[PDB]
């Protein structure tokens, strides 16, 4: 595998180079804007996934399942990362910066907003680095399947995370503690994604929001 053929620095460089861009909110209604934003983000995400070392090595069937399982998690960790410079606010887009109060007129979202804000705050207090961020996001993608190669690539990204921390001057003790905390936050992201998925499906059932074809298919996987 390519992932197993890279050094730690080569792995970081490949993940950083694979990064999707930050998109803007567009006109064509809060859910309408979010749906349009997420839909366009999904296209870049799929392209990003194909650029993650080890992902292409998977059969297309396996690739579909992982993305179907991870997509909302990946959207959320991206959102959480982008919001770190804005305490008490969610930066869905540079022209779409929302606080918890905006998530009231939709029901079930203000609770998700609070969790996203708290998660963003934790990453902020931990001084999360961009290099660490792209490792976690790749881990989320490869671990999404609650359902040996993937395990090998997961070990590779683990070593890469440890490498980054060692380079930063962190001691071995500080390394496994920081690693643990980051991975425990992934449990919170999984949780938020499950709740978000519930909210999206209920809104689809109530026919209050028009999700795109891709979002409909992705959501129908859950």
């Amino acid at each position: 595998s390519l992932a197993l053929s890279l050094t730690a620095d080569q792995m970081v460089s490949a993940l950083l180079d694979a990064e999707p861009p930050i998109l803007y909110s567009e006109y064509d209604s809060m859910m309408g804007l979010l749906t349009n934003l997420a839909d366009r983000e999904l296209v870049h995400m799929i392209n990003w996934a194909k650029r993650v070392p080890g992902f292409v090595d998977l059969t297309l069937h396996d690739q579909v399942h992982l993305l179907e399982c991870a997509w909302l998690e990946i959207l959320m960790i991206g959102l959480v990362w982008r919001s770190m410079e804005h305490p008490g606010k969610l930066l869905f887009a540079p022209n779409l910066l929302l606080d918890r109060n905006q998530g009231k007129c939709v029901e079930g979202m203000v609770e998700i907003f609070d969790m996203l804000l708290a998660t963003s705050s934790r990453f902020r207090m931990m001084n999360l680095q961009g290099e660490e961020f792209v490792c976690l996001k790749s881990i989320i993608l490869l671990n999404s399947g609650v359902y040996d190669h993937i395990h090998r690539v997961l070990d590779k990204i683990t070593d890469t995370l440890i490498h980054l921390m060692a380079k930063a001057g962190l001691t071995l003790q500080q390394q496994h503690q920081r690693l643990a905390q980051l991975l425990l936050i992934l449990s919170h992201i999984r949780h938020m994604s499950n709740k978000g998925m519930e909210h999206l499906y209920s809104m689809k059932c109530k026919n209050v929001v028009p999700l795109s074809d891709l979002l409909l298919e992705m959501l129908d996987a859950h």
């Binding site: 296209v43 996934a49 298919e217």
Partner: peptide
């Protein structure tokens, strides 16, 4: 086909 399926092979 599925959109995700097609985008991954396109």
């Amino acid at each position: 086909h599925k959109i995700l399926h097609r985008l991954l092979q396109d």
